[PDB]
Amino acid sequence: XXXXXXXXXXXXXXXXXXXXXXXXXXXXXXXXXXXXXXXXXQTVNLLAEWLIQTGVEPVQVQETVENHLKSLLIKHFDPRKADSIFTEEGETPAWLEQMIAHTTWRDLFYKLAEAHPDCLMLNFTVKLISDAGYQGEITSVSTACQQLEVFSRVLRTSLATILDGGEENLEKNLPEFAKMVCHGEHTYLFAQAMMSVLAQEEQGGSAVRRIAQEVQRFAQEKGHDASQITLALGTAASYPRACQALGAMLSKGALNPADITVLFKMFTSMDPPPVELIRVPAFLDLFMQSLFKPGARINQDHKHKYIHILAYAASVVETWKKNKRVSINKDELKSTSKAVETVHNLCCNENASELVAELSTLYQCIRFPVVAMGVLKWVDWTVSEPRYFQLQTDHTPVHLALLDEISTCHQLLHPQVLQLLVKLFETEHSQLDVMEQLELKKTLLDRMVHLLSRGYVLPVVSYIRKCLEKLDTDISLIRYFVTEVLDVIAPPYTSDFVQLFLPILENDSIAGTIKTEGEHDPVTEFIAHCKSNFIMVN
Amino acid sequence: ESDTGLWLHNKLGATDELWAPPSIASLLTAAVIDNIRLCFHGLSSAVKLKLLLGTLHLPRRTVDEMKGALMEIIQLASLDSDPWVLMVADILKSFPDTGSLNLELEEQNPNVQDILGELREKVGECE
Amino acid sequence: AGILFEDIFDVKDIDPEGKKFDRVSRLHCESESFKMDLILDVNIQIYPVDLGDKFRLVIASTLYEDGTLDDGEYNPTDDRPSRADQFEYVMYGKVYRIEGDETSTEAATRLSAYVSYGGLLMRLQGDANNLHGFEVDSRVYLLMKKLA
């Protein structure tokens, strides 16, 4: 019997219960009965879409902007004092419908905001994201992964994403995967245990082992002592004292000679450990650090023990016929030992005319992969010393000819080789002449062309496009790269190489590529072949 | 010592960090573990998880001294209704006994079953 | 009675990045119970501290057990009973900085008080419930005492 409404009829619920049982002084009741002092603006907001029909954009962005304003209001007027109370009270028709329709970022930002209260709302929204078909895809939060049913499935879909990705996606997805599984070290334990059980199989478990090794490398970067977890997952703990020695040594992150005598007494006997205890890559990286730094002298007595340990790591084969070995061999680790000994002598002698002299023996050595990885780390630690480029022969291409040898005789080192070349190319060399810096960059681009020749092309051209577009280098260097690449290649052309090599050539310095070639035609041939491949160019 | 549950919650209960903190082998002495064994159901799940992960960072001889008390803490940890404590107890039950962690995590858990089934299919098709 | 802070620490490191000064070294110490770090400059000559030691450390606003709040003048003839007779290494200095893990929205949890004893620096990083007695630009004492 009030009859005092403008648009408070939409609030007809709580009004009605305050209408029949009003009593006492209903001043506040009547004031809230007519607190909707505007017109029918809940319908006129729907008429704003009809006005947008005359506007520039009658699309779904208007309802998206209204829902974004509603989400910003629900986060601004978030009921943080009674968040867990309102979570634990109703929760049946509201959170279920909201996760049915508007589960895009609302409850995700709500669980990103506080995440300690509202365990009923967090549990219902987590179970509804579990009811979502693709996953865990809404809960992409480094601190909302503290629930096991959530985190296991998020781990599953991220592993599926990486394992369908490949080596290209190995660089892009792995920090976005590793910030979750290194957030808590117990989550690291869960993830590495899953890596172990999946890498029990020889039918594609090598990529799982690889992803485990990059997660372990990221754990070593961020600050874990994750080597003890790594050895506790391994079979190496079945032979206790060797694994304990590795545990202390990889907890120190450095080589102790007494510790390697403890290892070496257990090796080269008639009962070796299973070779997967020594194949851990952080251990071989500490070997490269302690052995092939240009300083860091090794005291000539347990040196052959070091070389024999690296040779046994990178040499021997085995046949695990139902968890036992019956046929191993040691007949190439003498050549491996001789090669790594010759290379450590050449890195110990530190005399550069001798480095030019024994370069044929060094070319004989880099036929071996562990030798080539070690020479790559040594040339990294030598050439990247500041104020190095002051010996100048053809702007010092000697170590870069060793880069060409490493790139020639192997293929798996090519990411590290490209990483070294793009580390030197980004590095501005002070105290050099600017023409001299420019010819140093021309030499590094000659090395990148040599990497492009041996198959490893797409990250190189991707970097050249990245440094023409983003944060630009000198245009003459890219012109020289295009000039040297197009003086060696010939059709047929794979579509990815055309798709990646087209925009750097056609945009931004057409004219500089052709000056005086004549006998073999310039970029015009590549443009003609690019028109003949694609569907016009598109 | 006295009030040792409060002592573990004081030295380990900074919930803003989630790794095993350093000097955890200097915080886990056999007398301290034998003080934990009677007040183990009182302290919080985060501190309990720090404790169970820190029991792996001990050296091998200290684990080999008093592995029975560590197994008792494991058996009390497997009874807790927390998901993390149950899973970490299921992993860590084989570490003081053998030296290696558990690899058979497959029973009593539909989570491990779903992840292993989907990932065995995925690994089988991604060679 | 005038004590701002009291805890037993345990020496973990003595000046681990090398010894910058021969007569004074810094001690990286952890607490026995409260989970707090203390970095302390001490004179090794008149008061040698070895690694693995355990000591009590009591910041007091004054030495006089009644809390009479002296100005800070050197009175070697005052026979009022002070608390320094319980201890064996008393350093007087001013607390110059209280930084902490704080946010512009919520309060600080982990505080870090800085105090210079003449020139001998001490950082005490603990929780805010234990470092609440500290105030910036006030005068404190140190009162450490080693014990087996």
From Swiss-Prot, chain A:
Consequence recorded when altering residue 338 to M: Reduces RNA binding
The reply to whether Nucleus figures as a keyword in the UniProt entry is yes
Q: Where in the cell is it found?
A: Nucleus
GO molecular-function annotation terms?
Answer: RNA binding
Outcome of substituting residue 265 to M? Reduces RNA binding
Tissue and organ distribution: Widely expressed. Expressed in heart, brain, lung, placenta, liver, skeletal and cardiac muscle, adrenal, thyroid, kidney and pancreas.
The GO cellular component terms are: membrane; NELF complex; nucleoplasm; nucleus
Q: Which keywords does this chain's UniProt record carry? A: Nucleus, Repressor, RNA-binding, Transcription, Transcription regulation
Q: Give me any GO biological process, just one.
A: negative regulation of transcription elongation by RNA polymerase II
Tell me which Pfam families the record gives: TH1 (PF04858)
Consequence of changing residue 334 to M:
Reduces RNA binding
Subunit record text: The NELF complex is composed of NELFA, NELFB, NELFCD (isoform NELF-C or isoform NELF-D) and NELFE; NELFA and NELFCD form a stable subcomplex that binds primarily through NELFCD to the N-terminus of NELFB. Binds RNA which may help to stabilize the NELF complex on nucleic acid. In vitro, the NELFA:NELFCD subcomplex binds to ssDNA and ssRNA in a sequence- and structure-dependent manner. Interacts with ARAF. Interacts with PCF11. Interacts with KAT8.
As for family, the record states: Belongs to the NELF-D family.
Role summary = Essential component of the NELF complex, a complex that negatively regulates the elongation of transcription by RNA polymerase II. The NELF complex, which acts via an association with the DSIF complex and causes transcriptional pausing, is counteracted by the P-TEFb kinase complex. (Microbial infection) The NELF complex is involved in HIV-1 latency possibly involving recruitment of PCF11 to paused RNA polymerase II.
- Name the record gives this protein: Negative elongation factor C/D
**Organism field:** Homo sapiens
From Swiss-Prot, chain B:
Q: In which tissues is it expressed?
A: Ubiquitous. Expressed in heart, brain, placenta, liver, skeletal muscle, kidney and pancreas. Expressed at lower level in adult lung. Expressed in fetal brain, lung, liver and kidney.
What is the annotated localization of this protein?
Answer: Nucleus
- The lineage's top-level taxon is Eukaryota
Functional summary from the UniProt entry: Essential component of the NELF complex, a complex that negatively regulates the elongation of transcription by RNA polymerase II. The NELF complex, which acts via an association with the DSIF complex and causes transcriptional pausing, is counteracted by the P-TEFb kinase complex. (Microbial infection) The NELF complex is involved in HIV-1 latency possibly involving recruitment of PCF11 to paused RNA polymerase II.
Subunit info? The NELF complex is composed of NELFA, NELFB, NELFCD (isoform NELF-C or isoform NELF-D) and NELFE; NELFA and NELFCD form a stable subcomplex that binds to the N-terminus of NELFB. In vitro, the NELFA:NELFCD subcomplex binds to ssDNA and ssRNA in a sequence- and structure-dependent manner. Interacts with the RNA polymerase II complex when it is not phosphorylated by P-TEFb.
The domain comment in this protein's record states: The HDAg-like domain is essential for transcriptional repression, and mediates the interaction with the RNA polymerase II complex.
Q: Which family does it belong to?
A: Belongs to the NELF-A family.
Q: Output this protein's name.
A: Negative elongation factor A
The organism's taxonomic lineage, starting at the top: Eukaryota, Metazoa, Chordata, Craniata, Vertebrata
Q: According to the record, which residues of the full protein are present here? A: 6 to 132 of 528
